[PDB]
Structures are given as structure tokens and as C-alpha cells.
Amino acid sequence: MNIGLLEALDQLEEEKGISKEEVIPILEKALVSAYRKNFGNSKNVEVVIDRNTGNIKVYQLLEVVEEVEDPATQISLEEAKKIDPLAEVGSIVKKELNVKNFGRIAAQTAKQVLIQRIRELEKEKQFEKYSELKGTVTTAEVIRVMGEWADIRIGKLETRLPKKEWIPGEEIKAGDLVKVYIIDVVKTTKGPKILVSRRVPEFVIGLMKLEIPEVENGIVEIKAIAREPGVRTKVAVASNDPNVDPIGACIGEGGSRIAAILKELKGEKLDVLKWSDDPKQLIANALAPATVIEVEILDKENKAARVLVPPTQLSLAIGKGGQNARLAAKLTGWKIDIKPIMNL
Amino acid sequence: MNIGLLEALDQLEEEKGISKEEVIPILEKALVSAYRKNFGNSKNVEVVIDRNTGNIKVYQLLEVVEEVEDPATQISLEEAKKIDPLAEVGSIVKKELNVKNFGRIAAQTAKQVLIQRIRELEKEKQFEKYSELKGTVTTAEVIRVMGEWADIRIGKLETRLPKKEWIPGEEIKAGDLVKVYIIDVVKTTKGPKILVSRRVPEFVIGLMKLEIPEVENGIVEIKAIAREPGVRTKVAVASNDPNVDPIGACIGEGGSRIAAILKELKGEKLDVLKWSDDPKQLIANALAPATVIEVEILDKENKAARVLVPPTQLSLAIGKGGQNARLAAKLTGWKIDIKPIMNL
């Protein structure tokens, strides 16, 4: 609307690289709308900016006709030709207008446009976002829960945490800070969205990586995990460095570390056990708590086994509703059958 | 140099999206050099194109001085002011020149520039190239060997195949078509380069994926591989679908498939064996050719074993220079000791 300087200078006045190869065509469009809501929709106008100074200049479009009935539009052939020598009836001629004000300045909207094109690059666009730290755990701020999900923020991004991906039975509330595992980050037609969960098995691995330097390190390796969300998780670990006790690094100084882990799990148990290449020792480590007398392989190629336990440890080994033996079986890939002994 | 139309029209005349937000500044630069080698270096000139029609227009720069001694450069204050009212001694004034020819047209160079900016996008730039099919095997054309490496082409790209990554002992020659495994593709300051090899273990897996549908499928899974480049490779396979014989799909109809595999390996052997979850059966499958009487575990947690074989199979099991037992040990992760039997 106004040619009051502006432009060029405001073009990247510190920060970011914005090619006006697109900033202006959008500004023009907006400026036409700007010119509109700041005078009237009586005149059909075009806003042009042929680079250089740019200088906002508007033209009133007029249809060349045989007889003028609406002077705001329409123009005679004779009058049209003075503007464009080649004009014929049916042609459109463009008459340049001036400027004005009427209180405030409309031209300032180029800002809105300018900024809006900034918010778009704020989304990395074209791809998704470097915020694609898929496979990790991060903290998020809970901004109101909606029943079936919770809106939460991570950095300058917000995303839904479906109640289906919450730890079963836990309770979340606005303000709470929660740890979440990042399954993926997808660039949608509304900005990048981070897919999150607190219930998949990798969430537990991520918490371990966070609280246990040796796990982040590789010094302690996670060889297997079995998780029943909200109930319990068994994880088998191995130490690469024969001088590092894997159990000890996971548990921490005085049970710290695991305490931090268990806190985020809002009540879900975690059995940290030692991995073994001998399936009989692995299976026995996996059934803790409970002491096994011995493991009998019932099938080497199909991995099935019969586990013998002292009576007084029968129901402990199976666990409430079979949870202990169930998790042990899942963790090991072996079919397990628990049987009480009979000492002679 | 010349304002003979040109520009705009040639701007993206079918194919590609090229923002002249950079095409012109480079054209200008080149045009200055173009104007130079097409007249003389007597006049210091600037070529400007303020978008719009663009129209190539040149200006001769003149230093405003107290006394003119070189009229091709230098201009008096009085004369300078007629051109730029604000000119002072020490200022630079720009005098617009016209056009010409002298045989052919110089302005055509905008092409070279135009194209050159095309060849740059041909490299995907910014990142590396979608040609990043890292982890696969592809065919390449051998364009001359240089002793320590071979220059070969893949698509419209060329890359070096170091002799160190050739199958030991093989011989390559210009014209040959060779299979190569893609380790990586890196965007260098000279275009993307594909890192290749024919000697790493994944090269064998890639050939298997190529010749064996079930492997590409997942129906047959590669569980372990041990390779001594140029000598022999043992690979252990398993079938997911209990109705598919894994050995049979790898070998193919009438030994075809494996024949194709062995051909690319220019002489290197390939023992395709069946994977087993029972280490005793795996170890026995791994020592083929040779028949094992039995496998005795010497250490369950440290995976060491003593393998018993009939005499008449002792040296066969160890293999030439220990190659058979060596590959079997590497493939299985187990330490193996071969011993002849003694039937009563």
C-alpha cells in the first residue's frame, strides 16, 4: 500500500538466510489483501515489486470495453491506448496509483508475512527436523491431559502422548515432567511431530542408558529384555570388561540408579539379571527371585526346558498368574516348565 | 556484454527449478570476465542485472581525481558530478556503456554458467545424493585399472576400487563388469563418492540377496558368516518357513544361483550350511566337509569345544593350513579342538 521506504533493509537484518525469491510474491499477494482491507474492495488492484528497490507500487486493473458503465473498472479503447498502445477491447490495462495512509500504515504487514515465512523454516521443512533423535528418551512437559491422550511439550514442540502409550495404570497431570521414548519424528503438513511412548520395551532401555553410564558406554551391554508394561520387566546384561560387574553398575552406588529408574516406571518392577551364553544359567538367572536346582533341556533344537525348583519356591518361580515364568520364557526365547524337586 | 534479448526465457525452459537468486550474481561475475576476454582489459567494468528484464548492462568504473592522467580510469570532479551529484574526489563513479559484437556473441557464456549450475545440482548437493544405497551390491563398469586401484563407473558416477578391496588374487581389466558392495556414499567437495569393496563379508551377503529371492525375502535368514577373502567363506542359514529348505533355496534349481554366486567370487569357495540353536549341531554343520562323530563342550560359559572325528577325516576337518577349523571357529564364535576317534 505505502512506498514509505521499507523493504531491502528489513531483508535479513541479522539471522537466517531468506531468499526473497519467494518472500515478495507472497508479500505482493498479502499486500493486495492489505490494500483491500485498508481502503475498499471497489478497485481491483495488483501489487508489483520487480526486485531492486522493490518499492511497493500498485496498479488498478481496468477492462477495455466498448462502453464504460463502471469507471472503477472498465475503460474506453481510446483511453486504454494512452496507457498501453497495444490495448484492444477485451484487453486489461493497468493504471498505476499513488500512496496514502489514513491513520496507521498497512505496509507493515510485510512483517507478518516476513515472520510467517520464518516460522515455516523453524520446522526445518523439506525433510522433518534435526530433532529426529529417534530411539532416545527425553523429558517432556505435560501441558494438560485430555482423557485419551496428554498434550506435552518437548523443546519448542508439542505432541500427543496417547493414554494407550502411557505406563498402564499410571496417572499423569498437567505440569508433570515425564520421560518418553521417541519412536519417530514425522514431517507432517502441519509441522514435525514426535511419536512417543512410555510403554514399549525400548523405553526401559532408554532409561537404563540415561542412569547407567556403562550402558551408554557399551561397557555393559543389554542382551535381552522382556516387558509387561505396568507389571514388571526383566533385563539381562553382560559386561564386556571382565573387571566391571554388570549387575553392580546397573544397581549403582547404593541402589541409586535403579531407584531413579524405578521412579520413572511409576511402580513397574525391573529384575536386572546377568546374561549367560549357557542357556541353563540364563534360564536360572531369569527365574530370580527363586532358586533353581537345575535346568533340564527337553529339546536342544526347539529350545524347551524343564526347570527343577525346591518346593517352597514352586509358586515363587511361577509367579503371580505365571508372570515370573512368563517373563523368563519371553526373555530367553525358551519354553519353560517348572517342577518341584524330591530329595532322597 | 550484449543486451541482445536473452535471459528470462532461457530461465528454466523446461526441467528443473533454478532460482536466479544466485544464477545472476554468478553470471554477472562471469560476464565481467566475458566482457574482458572479448575487447580488452583496458576498462574496469561492472556488469549489473537488477532482476526484471535483467538486461545485461555494463558500467565503466572511474576514480574521481584532482587531475586526470589516465582517461580510461580516472575522471574529474566536475565531470564526475554530472554522473553522480554526490561524487567527491576519492569517489568511484559508474558510466554506463553500450553494446556491440565483433564477430560472435559473448553473452552466450551465460549458458556455460547456466549449465555449470546444473551440473552442481546433479550432485544433489547440501547432503550427499539419493544414490546412497549403502549396504547393497551393484554392478559397476571398470574404466581402466591403475595398479593400486581401478576407476569404475556406477550410473553417472565414477569411483576408485582400491586393489586392497579387490578379492585377493583376482584380476580386473578395463571393460569388465564387476559387482561391488557399497560401504558408504560421501558428499565431498568434488561431488559424492561411493565407497566400494569386493572383499568385506557383506559383499557375500549382498550377492546372496541378489541371487536368492528367499534371502532378499527374509524367508531364508543369514545367521552368521565367516570369510577369508579369496580363499573361502562359510555362511550359516536358517529358514523361517518350516516348509522351505534353506540349503535348497541358496543352491538353486540345479546348483544355479550358487554357480552365479561363485562366478562373481572369481574362485573363492562358499560353504552354505544350516544354522542351529544347538551349538553341537552348529559346530558339526560348520566343519563340513568332514563328518563329526560328536561334539563335547569343554566350557559352557566361554564356549569351547572338543570335536571328535573319524581318522581319515582328521586333516579334512582341520583343512589346509587349518582353514576349515579356523573358519568354523570364527563362524560359530566357539573355540574348537579337533581330535580323531578310537572305536572299540
XYZ file of C-alpha atoms in Angstrom:
688
model
C 0.000 0.000 0.000
C 2.647 2.530 1.061
C 6.039 3.107 -0.619
C 7.397 4.599 2.599
C 10.903 3.165 2.254
C 10.737 -0.254 3.920
C 11.980 -3.436 2.265
C 15.530 -4.460 1.438
C 16.852 -3.203 4.783
C 14.411 -5.358 6.736
C 15.531 -8.166 4.423
C 17.609 -10.356 6.750
C 18.573 -7.718 9.315
C 20.698 -10.257 11.241
C 19.979 -14.008 11.460
C 18.828 -16.534 8.844
C 19.235 -16.633 5.090
C 15.942 -15.793 3.396
C 15.886 -15.628 -0.406
C 13.244 -13.070 -1.422
C 12.748 -15.278 -4.474
C 9.567 -16.158 -2.584
C 9.230 -13.524 0.113
C 7.928 -10.931 -2.365
C 5.420 -12.963 -4.409
C 3.762 -13.762 -1.082
C 4.127 -10.169 0.085
C 2.504 -8.995 -3.126
C -0.443 -11.340 -2.608
C -0.797 -10.221 1.005
C -0.286 -6.581 0.051
C -3.182 -6.835 -2.402
C -5.307 -8.090 0.546
C -3.692 -5.428 2.714
C -4.532 -2.665 0.231
C -8.049 -4.113 0.231
C -8.732 -4.060 3.966
C -7.443 -0.503 4.323
C -9.490 1.394 1.743
C -12.138 -0.611 -0.055
C -12.795 -3.509 -2.393
C -14.097 -1.110 -5.055
C -10.912 -1.153 -7.158
C -9.333 -4.366 -8.461
C -5.614 -3.855 -7.816
C -2.317 -5.560 -8.438
C 0.782 -5.031 -6.292
C 4.112 -5.349 -8.038
C 7.702 -5.393 -6.827
C 10.219 -6.008 -9.587
C 13.110 -6.586 -7.225
C 15.725 -3.856 -6.902
C 14.402 -1.196 -4.530
C 11.328 -3.363 -4.624
C 9.223 -0.267 -3.910
C 5.605 -1.176 -3.303
C 3.629 0.107 -6.272
C 0.001 -0.676 -7.076
C -1.936 -0.670 -10.337
C -5.671 -0.536 -10.826
C -6.758 -3.112 -13.427
C -9.297 -1.899 -15.997
C -11.112 -3.928 -18.592
C -11.087 -2.239 -22.006
C -14.671 -2.069 -23.213
C -16.891 -0.582 -25.985
C -18.868 1.474 -23.460
C -17.900 2.355 -19.896
C -20.655 1.847 -17.289
C -18.460 1.345 -14.215
C -15.468 3.700 -14.244
C -13.825 1.949 -11.260
C -13.380 -0.990 -13.547
C -13.749 -0.623 -17.361
C -12.051 1.887 -19.623
C -12.539 3.039 -23.231
C -10.248 1.887 -26.052
C -9.125 5.428 -26.711
C -8.274 5.984 -23.069
C -6.802 2.498 -22.747
C -4.330 3.089 -25.595
C -2.789 6.084 -23.914
C -1.744 3.679 -21.201
C -0.883 0.689 -23.369
C -0.543 1.331 -27.160
C -1.336 -2.302 -27.861
C -4.607 -2.326 -25.902
C -7.694 -3.698 -27.686
C -11.284 -4.216 -26.489
C -11.059 -7.278 -24.269
C -7.595 -6.272 -23.057
C -6.775 -5.407 -19.471
C -4.849 -2.201 -18.855
C -3.060 -1.380 -15.591
C -3.161 2.160 -14.242
C -0.563 2.998 -11.592
C -1.907 4.580 -8.397
C -0.118 6.517 -5.644
C 0.023 6.097 -1.872
C -1.540 7.372 1.334
C -2.208 6.375 4.931
C -5.485 7.090 6.796
C -4.277 6.705 10.385
C -1.679 3.915 10.535
C 0.493 2.099 7.947
C -0.718 -1.013 6.141
C 2.655 -1.812 4.576
C 3.801 -3.099 7.980
C 2.038 -6.400 7.248
C 5.100 -7.387 5.220
C 6.364 -8.185 8.723
C 3.668 -10.722 9.472
C 4.447 -12.248 6.111
C 8.176 -11.981 6.756
C 7.868 -13.639 10.149
C 5.380 -16.270 8.986
C 7.955 -17.386 6.449
C 10.319 -17.622 9.428
C 8.043 -19.874 11.456
C 7.994 -22.179 8.440
C 11.749 -22.591 8.342
C 11.543 -23.119 12.109
C 10.220 -26.511 11.049
C 13.349 -27.352 9.037
C 10.896 -28.106 6.205
C 11.511 -30.242 3.103
C 12.528 -33.163 5.343
C 11.410 -33.403 9.029
C 13.738 -31.757 11.609
C 17.130 -32.441 13.137
C 15.088 -33.036 16.307
C 14.893 -36.570 14.912
C 16.691 -38.177 17.885
C 14.575 -41.256 17.308
C 15.455 -44.081 19.661
C 16.138 -41.969 22.721
C 14.446 -40.954 25.891
C 13.892 -37.284 26.673
C 11.938 -35.315 29.177
C 8.747 -33.599 28.171
C 6.459 -31.138 29.870
C 2.847 -32.226 30.320
C 0.581 -29.438 29.090
C -2.903 -30.677 30.057
C -4.286 -34.200 29.721
C -7.328 -34.828 27.512
C -8.518 -38.214 28.675
C -7.339 -40.351 25.753
C -4.026 -38.549 25.487
C -1.896 -35.867 27.065
C -0.562 -32.867 25.199
C 3.068 -32.499 26.195
C 5.951 -30.367 25.092
C 9.467 -31.277 24.081
C 11.641 -28.255 23.385
C 9.605 -25.842 21.272
C 7.445 -28.734 20.030
C 4.215 -30.234 21.294
C 2.885 -33.697 20.682
C 0.212 -36.085 21.903
C 1.109 -38.866 24.341
C -1.724 -41.360 23.811
C -3.046 -42.864 27.025
C -2.548 -46.171 25.159
C 1.217 -45.497 25.309
C 1.246 -44.492 28.955
C 2.527 -46.960 31.500
C -0.683 -48.888 32.278
C -2.332 -47.619 35.424
C -0.089 -44.626 35.963
C -1.593 -41.181 36.305
C -0.377 -38.090 34.534
C -1.327 -34.460 35.160
C -0.586 -31.026 33.699
C 2.722 -29.698 34.974
C 4.227 -33.191 35.420
C 7.554 -33.799 33.797
C 7.658 -37.233 32.204
C 10.256 -39.264 30.394
C 9.206 -40.531 26.981
C 10.839 -42.732 24.365
C 10.950 -41.283 20.827
C 9.719 -43.824 18.327
C 9.900 -41.440 15.387
C 9.605 -37.883 14.184
C 7.477 -37.269 11.119
C 7.226 -34.150 8.960
C 3.511 -33.598 8.536
C 1.611 -30.922 6.637
C 1.372 -29.095 9.980
C 4.972 -29.383 11.136
C 7.141 -32.189 12.524
C 5.501 -34.407 15.145
C 7.391 -36.639 17.560
C 5.868 -40.102 18.128
C 6.304 -41.040 21.806
C 5.664 -43.831 24.260
C 6.392 -44.886 27.866
C 5.207 -48.424 27.310
C 7.354 -50.066 24.631
C 10.411 -52.121 25.817
C 12.945 -49.597 24.456
C 11.630 -47.063 26.975
C 13.234 -49.201 29.696
C 16.461 -49.474 27.697
C 16.489 -45.700 27.263
C 16.068 -45.107 30.988
C 18.980 -47.514 31.571
C 21.150 -45.599 29.102
C 20.268 -42.400 30.975
C 21.018 -43.580 34.501
C 23.820 -46.031 33.783
C 26.997 -44.615 32.231
C 28.287 -48.144 31.428
C 25.171 -48.877 29.352
C 25.534 -45.609 27.374
C 29.254 -46.586 27.176
C 28.856 -50.092 25.853
C 30.811 -51.371 28.872
C 27.578 -53.031 29.978
C 25.516 -54.449 27.201
C 21.858 -55.113 27.210
C 21.444 -58.698 25.998
C 17.649 -59.225 26.129
C 14.599 -57.679 27.676
C 11.032 -58.836 28.395
C 8.468 -56.305 29.452
C 4.898 -56.453 30.789
C 4.099 -52.680 30.961
C 2.982 -51.590 34.390
C 3.756 -55.010 35.867
C 7.433 -55.911 35.537
C 10.380 -56.045 33.210
C 13.289 -58.459 33.195
C 16.502 -57.341 31.515
C 19.644 -59.442 31.052
C 23.003 -57.672 30.985
C 26.528 -58.593 30.238
C 29.811 -56.861 30.929
C 32.367 -56.577 28.157
C 35.121 -55.575 30.591
C 35.747 -58.629 32.853
C 36.630 -56.150 35.600
C 33.225 -54.471 35.581
C 30.378 -56.160 37.454
C 27.401 -55.557 35.185
C 24.811 -56.010 37.941
C 26.678 -53.542 40.125
C 26.798 -50.784 37.547
C 23.069 -51.073 36.804
C 22.116 -51.003 40.525
C 24.516 -48.171 41.349
C 26.365 -46.967 44.479
C 23.630 -47.690 46.978
C 20.784 -48.857 44.833
C 20.741 -45.360 43.397
C 20.398 -45.503 39.595
C 17.978 -48.342 39.829
C 15.948 -46.167 42.250
C 15.975 -43.425 39.692
C 14.920 -45.999 37.065
C 12.104 -47.387 39.181
C 10.864 -43.899 39.893
C 10.125 -43.130 36.269
C 8.378 -46.515 35.980
C 5.789 -45.381 38.494
C 5.510 -48.787 40.102
C 6.587 -51.234 37.441
C 9.204 -53.732 38.617
C 12.592 -54.310 36.993
C 14.608 -57.532 37.511
C 18.200 -56.858 36.368
C 19.838 -60.240 35.753
C 23.116 -61.474 34.321
C 23.165 -62.737 30.792
C 24.739 -66.128 30.075
C 25.755 -67.983 26.879
C 24.853 -71.223 28.662
C 21.042 -71.428 28.348
C 20.853 -73.342 31.630
C 22.472 -70.482 33.544
C 20.470 -67.879 31.646
C 17.207 -69.637 32.428
C 18.167 -69.938 36.099
C 19.217 -66.235 36.277
C 15.908 -65.342 34.590
C 13.693 -67.040 37.197
C 15.012 -64.954 40.079
C 13.577 -64.423 42.531
C 13.531 -68.190 43.131
C 16.355 -70.622 43.349
C 16.661 -73.326 40.714
C 18.128 -76.747 41.492
C 18.808 -77.492 37.826
C 17.700 -76.970 34.263
C 16.976 -79.922 32.041
C 16.943 -79.425 28.289
C 13.929 -81.243 26.828
C 14.832 -80.212 23.285
C 18.107 -78.688 22.099
C 16.714 -77.550 18.750
C 13.367 -76.030 19.693
C 14.793 -74.698 22.917
C 12.417 -76.229 25.507
C 13.384 -76.927 29.104
C 12.208 -78.392 32.409
C 13.264 -76.414 35.471
C 13.506 -78.015 38.861
C 12.899 -75.957 41.986
C 12.628 -76.714 45.669
C 9.140 -76.909 46.985
C 8.706 -73.617 48.950
C 9.864 -71.973 45.697
C 7.326 -73.523 43.333
C 4.774 -70.699 43.312
C 7.571 -68.102 43.631
C 9.187 -69.402 40.441
C 5.891 -69.405 38.501
C 4.956 -66.075 39.975
C 1.588 -64.380 40.399
C -0.517 -65.558 37.488
C 2.542 -67.096 35.860
C 4.215 -63.703 35.408
C 7.647 -64.806 36.532
C 7.894 -67.877 34.334
C 6.131 -65.973 31.521
C 8.632 -63.161 31.554
C 11.512 -65.610 31.873
C 10.299 -67.517 28.866
C 9.911 -64.389 26.764
C 13.306 -63.049 27.815
C 15.096 -66.290 26.928
C 13.170 -67.442 23.927
C 12.910 -70.831 25.715
C 9.750 -72.732 26.614
C 9.949 -73.433 30.324
C 8.233 -75.903 32.569
C 8.622 -75.527 36.316
C 8.631 -78.610 38.530
C 9.219 -79.072 42.268
C 12.041 -81.436 43.349
C 12.089 -84.538 45.565
C 15.311 -85.051 47.574
C 16.180 -88.607 48.613
C 28.382 -7.869 -22.919
C 25.392 -7.834 -25.285
C 21.796 -6.877 -24.384
C 20.505 -8.879 -27.343
C 17.360 -10.150 -25.623
C 18.414 -13.381 -23.907
C 17.694 -14.125 -20.255
C 14.370 -14.789 -18.569
C 13.177 -17.019 -21.419
C 16.209 -19.286 -21.124
C 15.461 -19.270 -17.392
C 14.146 -22.799 -16.810
C 12.931 -23.549 -20.335
C 11.600 -26.967 -19.232
C 13.106 -29.118 -16.449
C 14.475 -28.225 -13.003
C 13.702 -25.375 -10.648
C 16.547 -22.860 -10.660
C 16.163 -19.726 -8.536
C 18.088 -16.913 -10.250
C 18.708 -15.629 -6.729
C 22.185 -16.969 -7.490
C 22.249 -17.555 -11.228
C 22.709 -13.838 -11.960
C 25.354 -12.837 -9.391
C 27.487 -15.595 -10.910
C 26.504 -14.564 -14.428
C 27.495 -11.001 -13.626
C 30.905 -12.127 -12.379
C 31.399 -14.297 -15.457
C 30.041 -11.580 -17.736
C 32.648 -9.164 -16.383
C 35.290 -11.780 -17.361
C 33.394 -12.337 -20.601
C 33.369 -8.616 -21.415
C 37.090 -8.702 -20.635
C 38.140 -11.505 -22.971
C 36.181 -10.043 -25.881
C 37.501 -6.483 -26.075
C 40.303 -5.634 -23.690
C 41.299 -5.276 -20.060
C 41.780 -1.523 -20.526
C 38.470 -0.537 -18.903
C 37.467 -1.651 -15.400
C 33.814 -2.652 -15.796
C 30.899 -3.812 -13.716
C 28.004 -5.870 -15.085
C 24.648 -5.356 -13.438
C 21.295 -7.096 -13.743
C 18.684 -5.771 -11.343
C 16.246 -8.586 -11.980
C 13.167 -7.842 -14.069
C 14.150 -7.948 -17.740
C 17.581 -8.459 -16.285
C 19.056 -6.832 -19.401
C 22.828 -7.075 -19.422
C 24.165 -3.569 -18.889
C 27.770 -2.614 -18.172
C 29.305 0.393 -16.443
C 32.856 1.640 -16.656
C 34.175 2.479 -13.172
C 36.116 5.745 -12.880
C 38.028 7.042 -9.912
C 37.288 10.715 -9.224
C 40.608 12.522 -9.023
C 42.161 16.038 -8.796
C 43.921 15.605 -12.145
C 43.174 13.062 -14.865
C 46.236 11.273 -16.304
C 44.534 8.079 -17.498
C 41.131 8.813 -19.039
C 40.216 5.098 -19.245
C 40.155 5.162 -15.495
C 40.031 8.486 -13.559
C 37.616 11.357 -14.032
C 37.466 14.987 -12.857
C 35.180 16.102 -10.017
C 33.277 18.400 -12.327
C 32.721 15.635 -14.846
C 32.054 13.095 -12.103
C 29.223 15.182 -10.618
C 27.279 15.218 -13.840
C 27.053 11.475 -13.426
C 26.611 11.327 -9.663
C 25.744 14.641 -7.883
C 27.200 13.306 -4.655
C 30.592 12.415 -6.150
C 33.690 13.704 -4.324
C 37.416 13.208 -5.004
C 38.074 9.655 -3.861
C 34.625 8.536 -5.015
C 34.028 5.998 -7.750
C 31.551 6.922 -10.466
C 29.988 4.412 -12.872
C 29.488 5.364 -16.505
C 27.070 3.185 -18.474
C 28.385 1.817 -21.777
C 26.534 0.347 -24.768
C 26.886 -2.926 -26.662
C 28.479 -4.431 -29.750
C 29.719 -7.722 -31.167
C 32.953 -8.118 -33.194
C 32.241 -11.449 -34.893
C 30.315 -13.693 -32.483
C 28.308 -13.114 -29.266
C 29.944 -13.186 -25.841
C 26.666 -13.097 -23.914
C 26.183 -16.778 -24.792
C 28.509 -17.698 -21.914
C 25.523 -17.282 -19.596
C 24.833 -20.790 -20.909
C 28.064 -22.261 -19.619
C 27.269 -20.611 -16.321
C 23.656 -21.754 -16.521
C 24.663 -25.332 -17.251
C 27.509 -25.377 -14.727
C 24.969 -24.527 -12.055
C 23.036 -27.528 -13.388
C 25.935 -29.945 -13.042
C 26.144 -28.838 -9.416
C 22.570 -29.778 -8.631
C 23.280 -33.036 -10.472
C 25.164 -33.838 -7.279
C 22.083 -33.366 -5.080
C 24.325 -31.023 -3.055
C 23.844 -29.891 0.557
C 23.704 -33.545 1.660
C 25.233 -36.384 -0.460
C 22.899 -37.994 -3.059
C 19.908 -40.308 -3.061
C 22.354 -42.745 -4.691
C 23.135 -43.596 -1.065
C 22.038 -47.251 -1.361
C 24.678 -48.094 1.210
C 24.663 -51.755 2.155
C 23.883 -53.138 -1.275
C 25.653 -54.735 -4.149
C 25.506 -53.163 -7.598
C 27.261 -53.633 -10.864
C 29.897 -51.191 -11.972
C 31.788 -50.672 -15.187
C 35.574 -50.892 -14.972
C 37.064 -47.858 -16.702
C 40.812 -48.603 -16.661
C 42.857 -50.042 -13.801
C 45.710 -48.003 -12.310
C 47.699 -50.600 -10.430
C 46.689 -49.730 -6.864
C 43.064 -49.188 -7.789
C 40.599 -49.371 -10.638
C 38.478 -46.463 -11.777
C 34.978 -47.806 -12.277
C 31.613 -46.321 -13.013
C 28.277 -46.767 -11.313
C 25.458 -44.954 -13.076
C 26.708 -41.477 -13.958
C 29.280 -41.675 -11.145
C 32.868 -42.857 -11.045
C 34.820 -44.054 -8.063
C 38.048 -45.822 -7.170
C 38.016 -49.528 -6.309
C 41.235 -49.928 -4.307
C 43.177 -53.065 -5.161
C 43.185 -53.557 -1.363
C 39.400 -54.081 -1.589
C 39.549 -56.423 -4.556
C 39.091 -60.118 -3.967
C 42.697 -61.160 -3.235
C 44.369 -62.603 -6.292
C 41.621 -61.804 -8.759
C 42.398 -59.810 -11.868
C 40.382 -56.900 -13.148
C 40.613 -55.143 -16.514
C 39.020 -52.187 -18.302
C 35.662 -53.142 -19.767
C 34.977 -55.791 -17.089
C 31.697 -55.538 -15.286
C 32.144 -56.237 -11.591
C 29.851 -56.490 -8.619
C 30.773 -54.269 -5.692
C 29.369 -53.773 -2.208
C 28.582 -50.156 -1.247
C 30.043 -49.347 2.134
C 29.056 -45.691 2.002
C 28.472 -42.655 -0.148
C 30.086 -39.419 0.960
C 29.449 -35.878 -0.268
C 32.900 -34.450 -0.851
C 33.986 -31.023 -2.056
C 34.191 -32.601 -5.525
C 30.874 -34.439 -5.600
C 29.501 -37.589 -3.960
C 31.837 -40.592 -3.925
C 30.723 -44.176 -3.382
C 32.987 -46.274 -1.123
C 33.151 -49.827 -2.516
C 34.618 -53.230 -1.820
C 34.513 -56.855 -3.047
C 36.347 -58.170 -0.024
C 34.317 -57.415 3.107
C 31.901 -60.164 4.364
C 28.766 -58.178 3.432
C 29.782 -58.474 -0.226
C 28.959 -62.189 0.030
C 25.667 -61.426 1.780
C 24.805 -58.947 -0.966
C 25.486 -61.490 -3.700
C 23.220 -63.928 -1.818
C 20.448 -61.329 -1.645
C 20.836 -60.824 -5.402
C 20.728 -64.458 -6.479
C 18.440 -65.862 -3.802
C 14.891 -64.486 -3.668
C 14.289 -66.117 -0.242
C 17.251 -64.227 1.246
C 16.005 -60.874 -0.143
C 12.572 -62.048 1.149
C 13.551 -62.898 4.686
C 12.238 -66.438 4.119
C 15.846 -67.584 4.440
C 17.852 -65.744 7.001
C 21.547 -65.362 7.137
C 22.570 -66.343 10.670
C 26.383 -65.952 10.608
C 29.189 -65.671 8.132
C 32.976 -66.154 8.247
C 35.051 -65.025 5.329
C 38.695 -65.429 4.272
C 38.701 -63.260 1.079
C 39.924 -65.140 -1.948
C 40.043 -68.418 -0.020
C 36.622 -69.435 1.286
C 33.538 -68.272 3.090
C 31.213 -70.237 5.332
C 27.677 -68.936 5.782
C 25.013 -70.415 8.065
C 21.371 -70.061 7.052
C 18.057 -70.724 8.605
C 14.577 -70.979 7.163
C 11.738 -69.144 8.857
C 9.110 -71.091 6.904
C 9.381 -74.756 8.058
C 8.296 -75.724 4.543
C 11.253 -74.045 2.854
C 14.573 -75.900 2.784
C 17.099 -73.128 3.336
C 20.005 -75.039 1.782
C 17.906 -75.771 -1.284
C 16.939 -72.178 -1.936
C 20.546 -70.971 -1.660
C 21.853 -73.697 -4.030
C 19.016 -73.249 -6.522
C 17.299 -75.447 -9.147
C 20.374 -77.277 -10.348
C 23.157 -75.634 -8.444
C 22.315 -72.499 -10.381
C 22.275 -69.478 -8.043
C 25.245 -70.769 -6.177
C 27.021 -71.041 -9.565
C 26.150 -67.453 -10.226
C 27.435 -66.599 -6.725
C 30.687 -68.483 -7.176
C 31.238 -66.813 -10.511
C 31.411 -63.335 -9.047
C 33.786 -64.659 -6.364
C 36.334 -65.478 -9.038
C 37.487 -68.632 -7.311
C 36.669 -68.124 -3.664
C 34.773 -71.024 -2.093
C 31.427 -70.765 -0.307
C 30.196 -73.426 2.166
C 26.442 -72.885 2.691
C 25.491 -74.654 5.926
C 22.410 -74.898 8.109
C 22.251 -72.812 11.220
C 21.354 -74.493 14.516
C 20.414 -73.210 18.003
C 22.158 -76.278 19.428
C 25.872 -75.348 19.373
C 26.805 -79.008 18.926
C 24.837 -79.251 15.680
C 26.037 -75.844 14.523
C 29.660 -76.782 15.111
C 29.179 -80.078 13.270
C 27.404 -78.340 10.325
C 30.254 -75.798 10.266
C 33.039 -78.375 9.832
C 31.628 -79.765 6.597
C 33.173 -81.117 4.562
C 34.068 -83.722 7.202
C 31.855 -85.864 9.311
C 31.843 -85.361 13.065
C 31.214 -88.228 15.484
C 30.319 -85.870 18.331
C 30.908 -82.504 19.916
C 31.993 -82.255 23.513
C 31.523 -78.977 25.345
C 34.677 -78.213 27.341
C 33.207 -74.995 28.723
C 29.579 -73.871 28.563
C 30.339 -70.265 29.500
C 33.375 -69.456 27.372
C 32.053 -71.568 24.545
C 34.958 -74.003 23.972
C 34.547 -77.466 22.491
C 36.347 -80.684 21.568
C 35.233 -82.224 18.283
C 35.692 -85.884 17.568
C 36.185 -87.080 14.005
C 36.998 -90.387 12.388
C 40.569 -90.817 11.391
C 40.512 -90.426 7.552
C 38.697 -87.144 8.301
C 41.236 -85.608 10.671
C 43.125 -83.457 8.162
C 39.898 -82.824 6.201
C 38.259 -81.357 9.306
C 41.258 -79.124 10.111
C 41.626 -78.215 6.482
C 44.591 -76.888 4.521
C 46.575 -74.796 6.968
C 43.750 -75.010 9.487
C 41.366 -73.076 7.230
C 38.380 -75.314 7.805
C 38.547 -75.356 11.586
C 39.564 -71.666 11.554
C 36.549 -70.621 9.560
C 34.295 -72.866 11.627
C 35.553 -71.297 14.807
C 35.052 -67.768 13.523
C 31.584 -68.555 12.192
C 30.427 -70.061 15.492
C 32.221 -67.919 17.990
C 33.373 -71.211 19.599
C 36.937 -72.345 20.243
C 37.285 -75.740 18.616
C 39.708 -78.571 19.067
C 39.650 -81.424 16.580
C 40.521 -84.938 17.720
C 40.443 -88.301 15.928
C 38.309 -91.093 17.469
C 39.147 -94.627 18.627
C 36.335 -97.193 18.184
C 36.345 -100.218 20.492
